[PDB]
Amino acid sequence: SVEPCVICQTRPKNGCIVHGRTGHLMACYTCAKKLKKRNKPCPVCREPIQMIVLTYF
Amino acid sequence: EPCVICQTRPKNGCIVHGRTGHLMACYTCAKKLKKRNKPCPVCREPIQMIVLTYFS
Ligand SMILES: [Zn+2]
Ligand SMILES: [Zn+2]
Ligand SMILES: [Zn+2]
Ligand SMILES: [Zn+2]
């Protein structure tokens, strides 16, 4: 999607939530860290945030 | 923004090296690069890991 981060609605989607061989790119990196830090699941699949990847194009 | 290699499939292959990832290629072209021991196209750094990427 060409939309911004689902949480802050301002920063770009650059926080790949990675769980196994798939990642879910919906949030910015800082909002993705905030979810993981507060022990929140992946917004898309509600599966635990195994790791977060600062994504660039 | 199609895959830079096959110019057809979407960019869904996150080349991951450390905590940063470079999203320029599709997953199957990204596998092909890693398989053949080719570096990351963007930074020419080793492909540690490839991630099939999907949006919300
Ligand atoms: Zn955000
Ligand atoms: Zn997920
Ligand atoms: Zn491709
Ligand atoms: Zn790279």
Author numbering:
A (entry chain AAA): 425 to 481
B (entry chain BBB): 427 to 482
What does the paper say about this structure?
The importance of the ubiquitin ligase murine double mutant 2 (MDM2) as a key negative regulator of the tumour suppressor protein p53 has been studied extensively. Second, it promotes the proteasomal degradation of p53 by recruiting Ub conjugating enzyme (E2) thioesterified with ubiquitin (E2~Ub; ~ indicates thioester bond) via its RING domain and mediates ubiquitin (Ub) transfer from E2 to p53,8 where Ub is preferentially conjugated to lysine residues located in the C-terminal lysine rich region of p53.9 Although the relative importance of these mechanisms is context dependent, in vivo mouse studies with ligase defective MDM2 resulted in the same lethality as MDM2 knockout experiments. The RING domain of MDM2 has been discussed as an alternative target to stabilize p53.19 The rationale for this approach lies in MDM2′s ability to still bind and inhibit p53 when MDM2-mediated ubiquitination is abolished, thereby preventing uncontrolled activation of p53.8 The RING domain gains its E3 ligase activity through dimerization with either itself or the RING domain of its catalytic inactive homologue MDMX to form a homodimer or heterodimer, respectively. The dimeric RING domain arrangement is essential for E2~Ub binding and activation as demonstrated by co-crystal structures with UbcH5B–Ub (en dash indicates covalent complex).
We wondered whether the sequence dissimilarity induced structural differences that could account for the different aggregation tendencies of the MDM2 variants and performed protein crystallization for MDM2f and MDM2z. Likewise, the asymmetric unit of the MDM2f crystal contains two molecules of MDM2f, which form a dimer. Similar to MDM2z, there was no electron density for residues located N-terminal to the RING domain (414–424, corresponding to 423–433 in MDM2h). The major difference is the absence of electron density for the 310-helix preceding the RING domain. A possible explanation for this observation could be the sequence difference for residues preceding the RING domain, which form a 310-helix in MDM2h but lack electron density in all MDM2f and MDM2z structures reported in this study. The helices are stabilized by a tight hydrophobic packing arrangement involving residues A434 and F490 of each protomer. In MDM2f and MDM2z, A434 is replaced with serine and cysteine, respectively. Both serine and cysteine would likely cause a steric clash and their polar side chains would disrupt the hydrophobic packing, thereby precluding a similar helical arrangement.
